């Protein structure tokens, strides 16, 4: 799909 490390794992 698209990388978890840029999405589900990304933080603010």
């Amino acid at each position, epitope marked *: 799909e*698209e*990388p*978890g*490390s*840029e999405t*589900s*794992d*990304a*933080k*603010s």
Partner: antibody
Amino acid sequence: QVQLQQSGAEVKKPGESLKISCEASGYSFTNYWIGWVRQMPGKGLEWMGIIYPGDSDTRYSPPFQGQVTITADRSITTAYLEWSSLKASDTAMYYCARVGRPSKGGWFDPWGQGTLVTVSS
Amino acid sequence: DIQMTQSPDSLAVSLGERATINCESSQTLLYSSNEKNYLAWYQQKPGQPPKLLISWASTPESGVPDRFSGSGSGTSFTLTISSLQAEDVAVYYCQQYYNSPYTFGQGTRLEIKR
């Protein structure tokens, strides 16, 4: 600069509990994922899991899901790895390592120097 | 869960010769949107923690000697040592950081062939 200072070598009996620590400095502790890698004697690196101290969110790889618990303490910039009941096959080197870029997933950089855990009767 | 398979397990290369270490992922590590490969290479010398050599597949850390290069894309990646030197004997690991867990390859042991 960035330092990841791990607690000392442990020698434990099977069935005992154990929490090892990694003290971080030189960066904003809550803006980086930080985690643990196991290396059993003579074998490869195994990614165990990571924690984001900004919101305590965690990730584990399946073989360590439900085996260990990773926590962090924002107030002392320290991450932890905990077993309830050690077994002999938990004998290994355990590396703490910070993800190499803030606020997102990624590779590990830098690494701690390691904590050797020996579990034996 | 992405599996990372390195080949060979063990590699013997004569000093001054090319050393080639392969890494294959079970899923692609190419993010089509930014065209980036979510692949790192690590070097671990005996008695020492692993050290990052390459991120984003094709990109060495600062101070990594020019004889190291990383290549490939998608599911097929290669670490190349153009001319093997004594200081290069180590175990090399690839690692994907595309989807958690960020799994390592099983390691490739590089030795001097004599």
